Structures are given as C-alpha cells and as structure tokens.
Ligand binder design. Sequence first.
Ligand code: SF4
Ligand code: SF4
Ligand code: SF4
Ligand code: SF4
Ligand code: FES
Ligand SMILES: [Zn+2]
Lengths: 48, 385, 70, 106, 205, 258, 126, 95, 113, 111
Amino acid sequence: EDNKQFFGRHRWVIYTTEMNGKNTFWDVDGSMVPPEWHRWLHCMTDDP
Amino acid sequence: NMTLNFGPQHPAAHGVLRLVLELSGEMVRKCDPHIGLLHRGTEKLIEYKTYLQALPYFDRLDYVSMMCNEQAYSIAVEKLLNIQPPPRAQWIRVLFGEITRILNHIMAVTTHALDIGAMTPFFWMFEEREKMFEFYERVSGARMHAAYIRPGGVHQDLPLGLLDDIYEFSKNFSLRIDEVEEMLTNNRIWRNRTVDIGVVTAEDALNYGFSGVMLRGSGIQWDLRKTQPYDVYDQVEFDVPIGSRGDCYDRYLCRVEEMRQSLRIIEQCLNKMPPGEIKVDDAKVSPPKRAEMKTSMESLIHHFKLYTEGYQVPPGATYTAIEAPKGEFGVYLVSDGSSRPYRCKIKAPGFAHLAGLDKMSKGHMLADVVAIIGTQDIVFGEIDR
Amino acid sequence: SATRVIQKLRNWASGQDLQAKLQLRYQEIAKRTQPPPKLPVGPSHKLSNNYYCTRDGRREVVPPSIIMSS
Amino acid sequence: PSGEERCIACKLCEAICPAQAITIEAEPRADGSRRTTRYDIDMTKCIYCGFCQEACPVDAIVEGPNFEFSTETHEELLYNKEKLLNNGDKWEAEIAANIQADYLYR
Amino acid sequence: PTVRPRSDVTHKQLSAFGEYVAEILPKYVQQVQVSCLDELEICIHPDGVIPTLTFLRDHTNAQFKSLADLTAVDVPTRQNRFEIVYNLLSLRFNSRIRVKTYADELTPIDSIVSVHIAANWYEREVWDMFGVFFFNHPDLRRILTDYGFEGHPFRKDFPLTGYVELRYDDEVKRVVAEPVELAQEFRKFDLNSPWEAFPAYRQPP
Amino acid sequence: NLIEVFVDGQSVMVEPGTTVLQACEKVGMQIPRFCYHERLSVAGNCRMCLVEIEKAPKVVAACAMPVMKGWNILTNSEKSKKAREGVMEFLLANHPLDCPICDQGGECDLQDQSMMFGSDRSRFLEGKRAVEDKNIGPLVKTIMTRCIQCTRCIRFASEIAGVDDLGTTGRGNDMQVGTYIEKMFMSELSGNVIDICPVGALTSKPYAFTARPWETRKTESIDVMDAVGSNIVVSTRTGEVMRILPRMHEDINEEWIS
Amino acid sequence: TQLITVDEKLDITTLTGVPEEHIKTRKVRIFVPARNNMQSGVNNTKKWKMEFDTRERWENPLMGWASTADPLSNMVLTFSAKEDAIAFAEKNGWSYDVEEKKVPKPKSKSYGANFSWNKRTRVSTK
Amino acid sequence: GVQVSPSGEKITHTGQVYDEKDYRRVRFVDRQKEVNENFAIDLIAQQPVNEVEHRIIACDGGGGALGHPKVYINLDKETKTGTCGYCGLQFKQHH
Amino acid sequence: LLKKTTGLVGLAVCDTPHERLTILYTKTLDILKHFPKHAAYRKYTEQITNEKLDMVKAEPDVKKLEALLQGGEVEEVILQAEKELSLARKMLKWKPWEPLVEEPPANQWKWPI
Amino acid sequence: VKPIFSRDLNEAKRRVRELYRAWYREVPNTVHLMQLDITVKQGRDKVREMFMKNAHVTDPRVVDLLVIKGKMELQETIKVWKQRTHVMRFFHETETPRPKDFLSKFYMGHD
Ligand code: SF4
Ligand code: SF4
Ligand code: SF4
Ligand code: SF4
Ligand code: FES
Ligand SMILES: [Zn+2]
C-alpha cells in the first residue's frame, strides 16, 4: 500500500507461491484473498 | 430487393433488434423492426407479486437509466397512496436521478459514437462512468441495479463523506464533457455525417409519439421537469436545449447541452442540500429503522406486514410521465385494493421512437440507419418489456 | 503524477488545466473508516400528537367522481 | 457470537424475494429452539437485490461482499443450507465489521 | 409532511373540462370519471373511438396531439373483459387525458392509425398481449410474442409460466418446444389480508 | 319488529336484541374485534370495537349495545379512529415481539388490525411483562407471554367444550390465562381452542414451525374418520399437508372441528 | 354495420391458444373462499374465486423443490358475481364446478342473555 | 463432532442421512459433501446459563441492533432454565 | 421582418399570416353553418373562433398575434386550426351531437371488480 | 353481437378456403427455400390437420379471428420472419404424444 497513485492502484497484493495443496505460481486467481484482508483490499476501510 | 435481416447479433442493433430491410441497393426502402427478441413478460410478472417485489423491474427495464425509472414507478405508487416524500429524500431523488441522467446521456453519446465509428468515447466517457458506478455501489451496493428509490422516499441514507466525492467528480467532469465536445462536434467527419440526414418534422414528432430528446431535437420545448413539476424539479432553474435544423446533429448538441445543464443542476443540488430524513414517517408505506425496530413493537408489526404482504394500496388508476433522458417514462398502475398491482403498462420512451424510425430512415442508407439508432438511443429491455 | 515536460505537452495539446483537474482520483476520496453517523428521526417521531388518523394519507383518497353521465 | 445459527425460520425472506428463490421448510430442532431443516437460496435465480438482508429481523441472512464465486457447473450455484452456513462461517470476519460500520444507516 | 398536499383548483378546472367533453360528445362518451389525482378518465363506446380521438387531437381547446400509452387491463368479471386505455398528453396545455373504452375478445375496436401513427405499434402490441382485432390496420403483425406463439399472454386466463418452453436437442439439432413442467413451482402467495382495508372503497352487498 | 338503524347513512332494518357488530355486518363494514368471536358468547374484554353512536360523548362497546332507535354508528369517525389506534397501542404496549417465532404470521388477527387500524411508532419504552409457559397438552402449545387476556378461549372451554379449565388467575398485567394446577387440558374439541385464539399465543405442536400461511395453498374438502362430515381447509405447501382448518359452514361444522 | 343474429354457446379455445388436454382433462372450481379460521375478517370472502384441479407436484431429484406438471395450477382468478364467473367458465369451455356462497346467519346475541336466572346460559367464568 | 453414516458420509444437524439404496449419492462420488462441522445443536450447551437477579430478563444477542429484538422472557420457572426464543441461550434465576 | 427559422422544423413559415388566419377562420366559420343549432360544438367552436378572429382583427403585429392567440407560434395555430377545419368537416360526416348509442353493462366501469 | 367480416358462416368458410388455397400455394416455397428436413406431402397434411384441429367451431367471429391468425401465420411464412426452427414445431418431432387409452394414462401419472 502507498499513497501517490490513483484509487484502486494504491492498495494491492502479491499472492503466495502455493496454498492448500495447489501450486499457484502461474495459475493465479482472486479467490485466495483472506477474509480479514478482503475488507481492506477493496478499500471498504482505511485502517489495516 | 433483398429481404435482409439485420439481426440481433450485429452490435449496432444494441444486441437485440431484428430489423428486416427490403433494400434495393444500399438505399434502404423500408425498415420493418420486429422487436420482441427480449420480451420478458414484466407486465404479466408484476401483477403476481407485491409492490416492493415489483420495484426492481425498473432497475432493469431502462437498464442504462435505472434510478430514473424507479423514481417514475415510486412517484406513481406515492401518487396512488397520496404519500409525499420527505424533502431531503426528494433532493436525493433529483441528485441521483441526474447522476442517472448523466449515465444515460453518456451511454447515448457513447453508443452514438460507437455506431458511427468513433470508438474513443466508448472508453473515455466510460472511465467517468466507472467513477459514477463507484457512487452507485457506495449508496446501494450494486453498480447498476440499485432499487434505492422506494415508495415513501429512498431506502437508506448516503455513506458519510460522499458529497465531497460527488463534488470532486463534478468539478472534473466538465473538462471531459468539453473534451468530447472538442473531439466530436467541431470536427469534419461528424459534420459530414450528421447534416440533413434523418430530419423529422414537428408534426411527425408530435403525431408519432416522439418525446423527450426527439422533441428537443425537433425544436419544441417539452421537458417533463419544468413544464410538469414532479419531485423537487420545480425548485431548480435550468435552461432547456432545443434543436434548430431537426437532424441527428441537433440531438447530439441537445445531449451535450443536457450534459452541461444537468451538471449545473447537480452543482445547485450540492449547494442546496437540506438536512432531514430519508424515508417517510409512516410505517404502512415505509419500513422503519432497525434501531427503533429492535426495541419498538409496531415497527416490527409493520416491518412484518410491509415485507410480506406489502402496502395495501387504494384502488384507482394513475400514470405519472416523468422525464427519462430517453424521453417519456410513466407507468399505468391499476390497483385492486390488495397489495398486488392488477396491471401496468410501462411507458417506454423508445417504443414510439422505433415505431417512427420507418419514417425517418427513408431515403438514406445503412450507415445512416446505424447512426440514427445510435442517435435515437434504443436499448431494449424497457421496449420489449 | 506526471512530469512537467509531458504535463506542459498535454497543456499545449489542450489549453486546459488537466494537472489541476485530473480525471483520476488521487487523494480527493474521503476516508473510508468513518465515525458512525447517527441518522435523524423524521417529523412524526413524537410521542405526543402521534395520532395516525390525522396524518393518514392512505385513507384520505376518495373513489373517483362521475361528474356528468350515468 | 457464541455458536448458535441465527436463522429463526420466519418464512418472510421468500415473501420479499422477487426471484422466488428461497425454500426454507423448517421443523423444530428437538431442543425447544426454532431452526431450519430446509434452506434453499438459488444463486442462479437470486437477483442480488438486498431485500432479504433488510427483511431479516435478526440479520441472519446477509449479503456478504464477495464476487469470487463464479463456478463451472450449474450445481455449484444452488446453495442449500450447509454451503450457505460455511459460506457465512468463511466470511463472518469480513461481514461483521461492515455490518458494524453500516447498521446506523439501516 | 406524510400526506401529499391537494390542489383542488386543477380538480375543478379539469372537472369542468370533463363536463365540457361529456356534453359536446353525447353519442360516444358513456361517463367521465375525475380522480383525486387531477386527471380525467373519459369512458366511451368502442364503435366510435375515432371521433373521440380525432376530437381530442384536432380541436384547438383539447389539443392532445401526442398519444402516449395504449393497452388493455383485463378484468374477467365484465362481459366485455378488456378495458382499453388511451393515455394522451397535450404539449401546449400541459395537461393529460385518459380515454377508456371496453372490448370483448370477439368484438373488435376500429383502429386509430389514421389519427395517430404512434399507435402503429401499440395496437400490434395489444393484438399480441390481449388479442382484439383492429379494423383497417396497415399491418397487425405480431410483435412481442414468439413466431408461432399460440395464446395471448397478458389476459388473466393465460398462466404466468406459459405453455411451451424451448429446449435444444441433438436428435434434430433445433431449439424445439415442449409443454412446460417446471423445475420449481412458482409459489402462489395469499397476499390479500383478510381484514377490511379501505372503508371508502367498500363494495355494497 | 324492525328498527331503522343508520350506519354512516344507511337504512338497515334490523331486529331488536342484536349487536352493532351484526348491524355493521349487514352493511359490509367490519368492526375490529378480539374478544368477540361470532359463535361464542358476548363478553367485552379487549375494547377494540369502539364506535360512536351519533354525538353521545362516550364511545360505546359495539359487542353489547342493542341499537334502540335511529342511532347513527359512525365507524370511520375521528373519536372512533382515535379509540381504535389507542386500544391497539394499549394491546401492543405489553405484547412481546415474538412475531418471527410465532406460528401465526399471516394468520395473526392482531398484525392485520395493527396494520390497518393501529398507529405507526410506539411510545412504549419501559419494559414488557413475561408469563410462565404452561403444560396444557401435547396438542396446544402455549407461549402465554403474548396473551392479550381477551378470554376467547375460556368462554369456549366453559360453554361449548365444557371443560372448565382455562380460566384467568390474578389481576392486572400479572393476570395469566390457563390451568392454575398443572393440569392436562386434553379432551375433545381442544384444537378448536387453537384457531379461536386470534393471537398466536397458543397454537399447535404438530404444526409448530413447519410452514407459514401465505406460503400454503388452501384447498377445501369434506372430512372423513368421524361421521359428522365437516368441511376441511387443507393447507398445502410444496405438495405436503401442513394444516387442517375448519371451513365455516353453518350446518354440520359451525366453525369447530374435532 | 348490421348486427348478426347468432345464438350459440361461446368458445375461445383457438383464441386462447390452450392445448386440448388442458380443457378436456381439467375441471375448474368456482367458489367463494372459506374464511381463514384463525382470522375473523371477511375481506377475503367478498370475491368469487376460480381455481383449477390440482395436478401432480413431485420433488426435484437434485434438490426437492415442488416440480409441477401443470402450468395452470398456479393460477387463481377473481370475480364478483357467480353468473359472470359461470359466463367466463362457459366461454373458456372448462368443466365447471360451482360451490354456492355461504353467509353467516343473523343470531340474536346479547350480553344480558349470558347472565340469566332460569336459563342455562349463565357462564361459570368471567 | 460430526457423526458418520453407515454408508460413510457425514450427517448434518437436520438429521439428514442418505440411505444405502439411494441413487442421489451419485453426485457424491469424487466430489465432497458439504457439511458444517459446527452444529448449532452442539454449540448451545457449551455456554453456561446467565444469572438473572430479577423475575424477568431481556436479551439482545450481543451488539444491540446487530443481534435480535429485545424479548422480555420470564424467569419465574426455576426447575427449567428460561430459554430466549430468538437465540437459544439460557437464563437461570439467581435466587 | 418575418422569421427565417420558424422555431420548429418541417412546419415552414408563411408570408401572409394575417391573411391565411382570417381566410381559414372564415372558412371554418362557414363550415359550421351546415352544423345544426342543436349541436353545441357549433356554439362553442363559433365562440372560440369568433373571439380569436376578433383578436386577429384587433392586432396587426405578428408577435402580438402569437401572444393573444396564446398558441405558441403563428404557424402552429395555423396548423392546428386547419386540423380543426378538417375535424369540423369530419364531424359533419360523423354527426356526434345525437345522444348515446348504447348503454354499457353496469359492472363495466366499476373499480374494484 | 357485432360482426368482423362475415354476416354468416359460409362467407367465412369461403375465407377459410381462400386461406387454405394460399397456404397450399405457399408451403413448397417454404420447403425448398427453408432447407427443410421434410417433403411437401406431410407438410400439406400438417396444414390440413391444423385446419381439422379447429374444425368443430361453427362460430363466425371465432373463425374470423382464426382467419386473421392464419393470415399472420401466412404473413410470417411468405416472408421468412419464421425460420426452420419456428416453422415446424407443429410436427412434434421431439415431444412424445400423450396416450389416449385408460391403461397407459393410469401407468403414466395421476390424470
Ligand atoms: S434468513 Fe432471516 S428472514 Fe429468512 S427465515 Fe432466516 S432469520 Fe428469518
Ligand atoms: S439477494 Fe437474492 S436471495 Fe436475497 S432477496 Fe434478493 S434475490 Fe432473494
Ligand atoms: S400473535 Fe403476537 S407475537 Fe404472534 S405475530 Fe401476532 S402480534 Fe406477533
Ligand atoms: S390465550 Fe388467546 S383466546 Fe385465550 S385469552 Fe389469551 S389471546 Fe385470548
Ligand atoms: S370487540 Fe367489542 S369489546 Fe372486544
Ligand atoms: Zn437472546
């Protein structure tokens, strides 16, 4: 997260290499967001 | 003459329309539109449900101008029930209905430009449309289909700090409107494209059922906002746009003047916002708040009956034509005295427009007829119902 | 967040102040972690004179008057 | 917040549902309590309209802020009761802060 | 603030206009109803609907040039079950008018193409949805129903879910039609409360 | 032997010894009721039925007024609507808010009269009474917290069922309805006590929570299995039998069922 | 325009577009509905309602929803007169079955009858 | 604490078990049957009774308007704990 | 001077508005001479055309004719008055002044039913 | 009752004969041009059995409304607004017919 870009750009995430027995090095999909961070990543709140 | 079907799948028919054209050459003789490719039976399906269950049809009928149609349907239901909205909610009605006016005119200028071939305001206006759909998702939680206007005023309040973001949108929207007006009105291609093509007389524009921007392109002064005062549109002062030569170019500049005038009324909507409440203070047409519901009793009784049965609506017929930015939108509700509507016809603006397209497309060709469906701005959910 | 040479290039291309009024929201968004807003009550959340028969908008309508014929 | 499934079988959230998507045929739990034995929303019907999250008197059904549930077969958008319960168990930490920041508006 | 305020000056001046049209057209006008919502409901006779709408369009003191809406409402209690409305709207007088006539499904209504070409599509829509013959139409071709849809759907004796339902097959590789049996029955709700709702709209026994 | 009776300007000729409920039932306007069943005895215990009697300054209970001579019953008047909305606010003061727990969602006869004849926003902010639940039987579940003490069940059990078990103990808001000793009220005609009760305070345990009456489809039949041949409303939800209710028939049935 | 003088019973089978099995194998009930017995209101029972014979409703083998064979089973219809309802049933051609309207009778109910000296109408509770 | 079927699959808190001679487990091969491990019947006896010093009490479910409406339940019965009809958590009279 | 743009499109401007308006108002007065005196459309149409023609011979200015005709613009009331002339000839063909041709059934115009 | 076109039954029967003549004239053009998977003989027998389906009505206004519905089917068959899918759902190539005897109707369902 930083500040000097526009909105939607300024909070983002680099995903894991693997989780839950599936290697997500190349096949990368947006359903592996944790639920405590899903509120933060879509800018529903300002605090981490 | 080839009996060419123009087909739904060709993207300048907006996905839906089967025109057939018995064309000799590319000079099209007659164009016979069989709409009905999106016929969903909304007027049959409205009757078997309650009124609050009949609300989110009007999110989806004119689907590029949503909150104008639920403003139309809820002003018909509130005129049936004789319930005045609260004035803070009425200013919410005119503010988000003019966000919806900016929405439909962005779609009109955009799909006119895509049907002619200017692919540039299919993305440039749509970035600011995404900025507006952030506000739609901020208020309701859906980007298109809000169902935020209820009978008895709007559903919830705004989230906090919204009006600063509406003001910071509106100060930056004017340069993009002037930018599209620089790119697409003073140019040579659109001036060669949109002069003395598709002219309708004012006699034909009255007798063909044309309304709204077709009548303003024909030059007569028939906005449904100042001539017929509904909601709180009588308090704001706007100029109306009128056409002179009667062609599709006059509809394009009346949409540009409607952009600037609706942004002016949005500026005075932000300047003249009153404090107040969001629903009416009547538990039999408005659902109560959750904090008074969890402690009070009659709030939960009326919550139960308004969310299962709905409003017991007194019988009679009303029809409240409001200014959709396509044109005339009004719903002819009849009520049996129960909580279901008996029937309604939903007034499509473009129904009589695409009925009268056979008059204005004579003596032209196929690029002129895709320019005239882009000009006339026909989306088909409200038309096929 | 552009530099001055390309900013003056698009100001030469426009004549307008795009740097002052960009189309992309940088820091004009209000803070999404907000205080909880206490919504006001309406004009008839009063315990006295709360009679529904005076404010009754759904019973004040009349069946429509046949004026002239039959 | 201490166990105990919130859905109290009112049969009012299908009287508000314009999809007619919800079949919530219940029985008593043989406990003295009052829960559901049959819940069905239909995600293929399911207009995503927010009526059932405002109808609900205890706020049991909510409409949690997700969009990453596009599936490949039609059977996986036919959420009956256990898929809905572990959906709310999956997203309960995401929903409840939005409800705590949103319940003054509703 | 809850009840909508009532402006009765429009009620009396449109009621004077309703008495005016009810006197000047005594052959066709069966009654004129004025609601509490400052609009007029002139109920007429269907053999002479074109003198009524040519008088409402062409006269300088009515001047309802722009037709807006045209359907039926199908009430099966009446012997003539369809109740055809014509919602018209003056540009110049800033006023509205409603013309209600009746229809059986066997007794036709002569069409209003010669006075408004707005109803070139509205009467075709009425012929789909309810099913009345319109006399001397240019083409009363079906518009909103399927190509080959037997049954006018907006009547009360047509069901909600229809009768045919389409389905692709690989026996014939066409989108064929089957008689519909539902995946899920539409649950009919008894939304009519059993208590008396409005004492002004009370039916005498 | 007829009396000229005005009901908002009507001219009903009615026999003496009648009620204002019947004098308005001959017109069509239905006076709101909780204590008075039609086929039980008159006892004014709920005071919902208040209408004024043309300019006498006290509104009168329409259960127990024989109309004398020329009384114009103003059903939709100012003081009658004030009395109806006031008595609904009195009923909904100490009512507990168990309406999603309740078996009578659309079969509640008090939600409908609150919806059409009550106020909007309650001024009750103080604290509700709550009543100990009973052990009446395996057929009549009693959550007596929401009982409005309207005595429609004790008159049926004291007059037609003939059991003499359900009577009121105490006074005030501490007055509770039911068996004082822990006694199994279980005889014939005990499921009629369920449908007589306009509140959903006492209802069934077999049909405890299984359906809700707008969801059900009500189709009619005759009875078997006892040889009265009574008239049956079967409530069907998704092709499953949910309630059996007495269809009103003045021969055979007279609104009760075994 | 000239009036045509015909006298036959009316059929709108081909206009209504219904299949032939939905007329010839179906019967229709014209009835004032029963009062709901936990209610004491009469406003449901002022309208003459039309319903069809109920056909088969099974369980969906994936879920268990009500799957109906018949599209006509969802319909109820509203009239206000029995002879107008029988005119609608005779023009649509379905096999009618009419139940007559049953009204309450006037019963002499008095409060002073409930406390009588020689009669058995004295109620033991109050 | 999820009980298992005689066939081998899980049983929900509604008591539903598919029988051995049923075809409706044929969507259950190589695709997992979703059963919530936290049964609402089992997660109500874990929390103890709440002590009430009065003859009546009124719960909210925690959070005020987040929870349930404020039902006043009776605590005069001492032999059986007065259950809240909205939640199901139990109250016991202190004296 | 006459207006170049008419304020509309298709409805063309005319050079002699006083002459066309007096001539067509005398024509629509002459059409109603074959109307019966029992017909009250003759009395009210003769009243509105006589009062409007009195305004026409009162004022010689074109914008004052627009302001006292109160019909927007002079070409619009020329067009609508020629539609009124065709309406008067068509209602001579139809004869609506006689009484009602058929009473409805009594349940036809009752709501709710 | 008010008529539509016909003051009697035989004039409407002549209109029915005219519509049958035009349908029999039209149908080999909508066999050859439609690229249809049938011959012309069972298509003409389908037109004849659809005429015999509503053969029982002797009412002139009902058969005049059948004349305008056959004219709309003719108008959507002369021009090719109908396609090869819409034009031959009448044959019921996929839907099995409901049996008319008592035993198969007993075995099939509660009817
Ligand atoms: S989801 Fe809510 S409204 Fe629906 S039955 Fe459950 S608790 Fe009641
Ligand atoms: S969000 Fe879905 S399930 Fe909920 S009420 Fe709306 S359509 Fe029904
Ligand atoms: S009986 Fe009482 S608790 Fe039940 S729904 Fe009616 S008001 Fe609510
Ligand atoms: S249990 Fe029911 S019938 Fe008996 S007094 Fe209470 S509310 Fe009345
Ligand atoms: S209704 Fe008369 S006192 Fe109860
Ligand atoms: Zn609780």
